[PDB]
Amino acid sequence: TTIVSVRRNGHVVIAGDGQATLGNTVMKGNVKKVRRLYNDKVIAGFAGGTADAFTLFELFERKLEMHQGHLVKAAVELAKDWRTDRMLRKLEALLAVADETASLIITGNGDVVQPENDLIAIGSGGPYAQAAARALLENTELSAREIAEKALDIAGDICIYTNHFHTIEELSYK
């Protein structure tokens, strides 16, 4: 699994592969690991069980409604209940989420993190995608969509747990 997020020129994207591995076998190659949230104003991705993310995504929209869609404050309340609740503590996933404000990562340890350039790269192939996205962002004028697309393909060539099926959700704010 690999998920990338890039922000450039008033645009931010999130891309993820579709591979689902069971041991040394491929279970499903067209998994949709990216989706939109909060009435199309928020994009998000997840590395882990499908249902574990759907639960965290729904509760994340709840925290956004309490906080008027504030991404950072809602992310802290989600990470707060994730570590706290005995039910949510059992969930194991790596969430990635972004809006026009900023991009950040959420973990099951309760840790909320914003990467240096809002450059997110998670999953088993995350480090491989961060290496490629870091290269293009500093050496090219390519849009955030082209960077996340090419970086995810390179991660699929390297990571055995990542394939080349792609799902992207762009958000333009300019």
- Return the residue of 11, 59, 70, 115 that touches a copy of itself, per CB under 8 A: 115
The CB-side HSE value for 52 (13 A sphere, CA atoms) comes to: 16
User: Is 134 near a copy of itself (CB under 8 A)?
Assistant: yes
Phi and psi of 46, rounded to 5°?
Answer: -155, 140
Which window, 7-15, 23-31, 34-42, 62-70, contacts a copy of itself (CB under 8 A)? 23-31
Q: How far is the CB of 33 from a copy of itself (least distance, A)?
A: 12
The identity of residue 5, as a single letter, is S
Q: Check whether 167 is labelled as a binding-site residue.
A: no
User: Is 65 near a copy of itself (CB under 8 A)?
Assistant: no
CA 154 and chain centroid, separation: 17
The identity of residue 30, as a single letter, is N
Q: Check whether 21 is labelled as a binding-site residue.
A: no
Q: How far is the CB of 111 from a copy of itself (least distance, A)?
A: 4
Residue 94's DSSP bridge partners are: 47
User: Is 174 near a copy of itself (CB under 8 A)?
Assistant: no
User: Is 154 near a copy of itself (CB under 8 A)?
Assistant: yes
- Return the residue of 59, 102, 112, 168 that touches a copy of itself, per CB under 8 A: 112
Q: How far is the CB of 64 from a copy of itself (least distance, A)?
A: 16
Q: How far apart are CA 153 and CA 156, in angstroms?
A: 5
8 A C-beta contact, residue 34 and residue 169 = yes
- Return the residue of 126, 167, 169, 171 that touches a copy of itself, per CB under 8 A: 126
Catalytic residue numbers, as ranges? 1
Q: Which of 173, 154, 170 is nearest to 36 (CA)?
A: 170
